[PDB]
């Protein structure tokens, strides 16, 4: 809901901090800019910790990462 709820309301967003400012001079819990200190622990996607997925077409569904590694989990199952 309201990020500066139970307060005067949001003034603006400091993009240097990536945080919004309430009418009272306290930082709200919401972020505004993507370039801000989040907490990144869990993420999606495959060919991780590798070169990323090679974008070529293939006959089989074997996805080979750009370091040469092959991810059979990201690949399909026969």
């Amino acid at each position: 809901d309201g990020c500066c709820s139970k307060m005067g309301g949001i003034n603006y967003c400091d993009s240097s901090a990536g945080r919004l400012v309430c009418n009272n001079g306290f930082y709200s819990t919401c972020y505004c800019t993507r370039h801000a200190v989040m907490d990144l622990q869990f993420l999606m996607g495959c060919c991780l910790w590798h070169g990323g997925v090679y974008p070529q077409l293939n006959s089989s569904g074997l996805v080979v990462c750009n370091d040469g590694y092959v991810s059979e989990e990201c690949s399909l199952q026969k």
């Binding site: 306290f26 972020y31 989040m38």
Partner: protein, 151 residues
């Protein structure tokens, strides 16, 4: 859009200001200037008569303290314990040290997201009040916990 969090996890400013109002109307003092936040607790409501023993109701207040501490993104934590002059210098220094040690131990046992926690005590070396009528009921028998909010 939905991958990034809209706010920090479990953080609500209405919740923060509500528990702030509840704590300062209960009698636990909270100082809030800049990013610096301090909490002052009377020692009579926490410990026994010049003793390092914990009351059973005090764990509720410690749980409230941990609930408040969850809502902030901190880095460092400082705990100090101060007492009145009772017997000596060393006895009060050791008593304040033990009280600070055990309260920091329980705080670290609970889910604090603090990288670094410091704990110490001094006794009656730095008082805040010259009114020295009461003993452990005197307000300068106290415990302080402070930090600076980091971004």
């Amino acid at each position: 859009v939905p991958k990034l969090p809209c706010r920090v996890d479990g953080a609500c400013d209405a919740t923060i200001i509500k528990m702030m109002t509840d704590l300062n109307k209960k009698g636990i003092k909270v100082a809030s200037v800049g990013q610096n936040y301090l909490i002052s607790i009377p020692a009579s409501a926490l410990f026994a008569d010049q003793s390092p023993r914990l009351n059973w109701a005090s764990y509720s207040l410690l749980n409230e303290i941990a609930a408040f501490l969850k809502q902030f993104r901190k880095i460092a934590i400082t705990v100090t314990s101060y007492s009145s002059k009772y017997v000596s210098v060393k006895r009060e220094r050791a008593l304040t040290l033990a009280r600070s040690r055990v309260v920091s131990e329980y705080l670290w046992s609970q889910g604090v997201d603090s990288r670094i926690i410091f704990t110490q005590g001094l006794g009656s070396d730095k008082p805040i009040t010259s009114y020295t009528l009461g003993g452990d009921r005197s307000p300068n028998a106290r415990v302080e916990i402070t930090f600076r909010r980091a971004v």
